[PDB]
Amino acid sequence: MCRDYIQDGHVDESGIFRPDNAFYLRRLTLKDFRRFSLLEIKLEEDLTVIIGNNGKGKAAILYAIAKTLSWFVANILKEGGSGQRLSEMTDIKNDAEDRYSDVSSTFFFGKGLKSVPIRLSVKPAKDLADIWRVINEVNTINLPTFALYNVERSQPFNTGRREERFDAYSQTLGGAGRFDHFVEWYIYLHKRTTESVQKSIVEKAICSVVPSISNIWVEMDLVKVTNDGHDVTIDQLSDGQRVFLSLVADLARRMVMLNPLLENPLEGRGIVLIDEIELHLHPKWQQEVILNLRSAFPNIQFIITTHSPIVLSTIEKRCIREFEPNDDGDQSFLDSPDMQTKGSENAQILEQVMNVHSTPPGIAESHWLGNFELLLLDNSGSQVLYDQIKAHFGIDSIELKKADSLIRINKMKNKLNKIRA
Amino acid sequence: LLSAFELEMCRDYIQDGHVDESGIFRPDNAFYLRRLTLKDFRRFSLLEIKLEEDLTVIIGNNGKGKAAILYAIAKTLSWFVANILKEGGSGQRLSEMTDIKNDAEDRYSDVSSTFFFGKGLKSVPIRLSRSARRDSEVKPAKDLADIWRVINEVNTINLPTFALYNVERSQRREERFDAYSQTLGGAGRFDHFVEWYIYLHKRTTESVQKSIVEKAICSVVPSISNIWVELVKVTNDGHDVTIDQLSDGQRVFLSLVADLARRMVMLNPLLENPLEGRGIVLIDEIELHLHPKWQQEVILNLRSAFPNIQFIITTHSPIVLSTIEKRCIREFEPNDDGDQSFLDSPDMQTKGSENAQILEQVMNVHSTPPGIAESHWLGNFELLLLDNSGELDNHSQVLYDQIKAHFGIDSIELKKADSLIRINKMKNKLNKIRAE
Amino acid sequence: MRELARLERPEILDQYIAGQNDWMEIDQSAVWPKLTEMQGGFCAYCECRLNRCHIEHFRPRGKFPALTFIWNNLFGSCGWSRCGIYKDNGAGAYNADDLIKPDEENPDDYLLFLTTGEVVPAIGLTGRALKKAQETIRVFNLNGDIKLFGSRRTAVQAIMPNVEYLYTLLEEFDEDDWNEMLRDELEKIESDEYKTALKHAWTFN
Ligand SMILES: Nc1ncnc2c1ncn2[C@@H]1O[C@H](COP(=O)(O)OP(=O)(O)OP(=O)(O)O)[C@@H](O)[C@H]1O
């Protein structure tokens, strides 16, 4: 029946379950939205990253998918439930003539449902969400997981809240995970301790994804963690540690509640948005965050946003959507950059993917290696140049190691010229 | 000063100063924190930090106390503002539950500090404390704050500024003493700034109070070309935008700059250029939501606007460090037991250095992701190339093709690979020549 | 490391005998000049410029008390997460025999330096030789340290245009003065940090 179209799948040789009718956002169009007159994005099935100078455009995007997914969420929850919508919250482009704004998005739900076009402010998303509701009522199915993690998840530390799978979707698109809800659910599972496998799966997710936390458990009621080899409390954790903990734990809780029938609930289909993946993260964790997420979140279409090149060093260039500088909202289509970023040098990423130098041009320290090179090649290899190399240099600093090599090459080229003559 | 307070008395001590040739006012008796000491506090058994009077950057891995320091400083600073506002303000206490090291047989903690206040008060010792009986030696802090309050009451003086801009920065308003309203709360009262600005325009001296903060926005925040109000409107990215429509992080940086400008311009009415007032400002994650193009400008512009304010800053951005002198960085050891008693500057000069250098020598992270198997290809290609006398081989050719396909024909890695091939083959030809 | 000639022992060591004398009974300034003449101011294990000077007992004092005052057991190490400090409190379960002692064994016979800043055992090593080079890499942390790798890599890449251009001029002259140029280049690297890696870059083999 229609249920088999949703429930069937196949496992990879890696052990990852793959839904054959994979659900992901395929194409997205914004008309007169925020700053875009008309803009088209094609999304990757696995992972997509938007980069750019100002946070406004990238947020906008993620805000648009969140509000679009809200209709799916509401119609999954309540019959004909009206989801979040624009309805004119000054989201109209500030000088648009149409005074109208459409978020045109085309979801793909496998071979059969090749196109599900939704636009906000026809809403046929109910036509699929009615299937997601009526099925999972007659017989349970692994519902699609949705989430948005905005800046608001850095918050300082009314429902049944528990044993109901629809405690998810409660405030998932609000921009901040319900970390308190996760703590409550954890406390109740620990009190009762299937609940055990849910708890163990969540704990494994925290331990694997988050570097610092090696173990987590509950004591008399209060939750303890083994952070940096020390047993401290949740509120004792740092802001960065707590933010990463809240994001991972909230997503894991929602997804284990939404996908009860999976052998591994961690790999259910869904769409997850992350506005600042590098929020309060040391570069050492930035080099590992996406690998850890993707290894723990296989099938999820991550549409994330970052300003950190260390993150981009771990992403193929096909997954970047790059807002070229000097990009007025009239740009029709975002596209990948030329340089392959995965595994490349950090300085090269700085120079060619974000168009800023490896050295800050704001300060010189009253000398500059480029000036020394220019003078040396002008003179072909000497008091002013030696004065330049005596500025702070004369030390092991790379600034001297390159200068001496260029002096050697200039003198050697002069000797070659002398012999040739 | 204390003897004079018991006895122009104590007013010229706080008010005297001079102007540099650069135009920046310098107080003769500068106020800043010199030495900070913690005992049985959070992750620390004992730790002492020495601060500069111009800048201090605190860096390290996740955890490590970079915020703690700022929290302890703000808790210490709460006793200053409370007694500036009113006699016996009683300040704020340490958290009896969270601010004591969990493994400590003393079961009590102390936070010790010393505030230099000119050639008179070479040392103003303070010791906040809590117990799971332990008391606080806040008496000289009370004395200094009482001098400030009483002297201002008889004749107004430019009071010191204190602020803590924490993570919470992103989630009657007309009396100059309202500047201390939740000023250590972790987030600037941006709504209070909005109300203050609206009141200023409605009244529209107050005009220069408006223009000073406007200039602070225009100069420090890179995006904002101009600011005005009907609700507040901004010229953001070249076209008019509403205040609530500002970009994330753009708005956060805006809130920081505007709140600090308002607080400081209300606290220092007698300055010719108010921006040069005394104070201590704590910032956590200075790089928050900032693109690297703004990271390489934020500290330079921020300190150009507020010259003699003592900044204590936590950052995770190697781009930011490239604008900081070596003496100003304070780092933690990446492998420490928590009993590390001091912490000191780096060995390399970071001001003006390349990002790749700072990324590895200071912050101790590989310049390329070691977890990406594609980064190791040059090493394997080099090892294979020299495995047979340094000339090209079929396995080496396959690796060369993989590098060409993955990184690209114009990529730097392929240029390295082909130069390696050329040099090693030549070397082999030299070896063949020397063989005969 | 480099190849070093064990210098004549300083006479100051003869007044101390193992057991009844602690190491701190020796004036460190009375033994440092001989190590400086030995090493030219660079670390014995990683060839970095010595600024955080540290007299190092190649065989540890705690496990080898009898060799605490033996002259052939003293090296001037830097430092800490590398070299001697990693040797006594970072690594473990090692045998000092497997470590390359750079005063009586040629380091180039075991250790090979790439252009990429990494150090791997030399080509053709088998059995005890490869084990020797591997433990020398590990215990001294010759490449696992980020600081050391980064500095060595940035030093090696700094001279690569020179290595490229030196050999390009092979057919430009008769080989005698080209050999003179190569010798001159091999002379300068002796006064620079990580000279073994630079030699591996410049040398024929
Ligand atoms: N009372 C305490 N007893 C023991 N350990 C504590 C205590 N309070 C805090 N800690 C430890 O100190 C750290 C608290 O975070 P810390 O202030 O060091 O980080 P931070 O400065 O916020 O850094 P970031 O946000 O960059 O990770 C944790 O590692 C926690 O285990």
Ligand SMILES: [Zn+2]
């Ligand atoms: Zn060394």
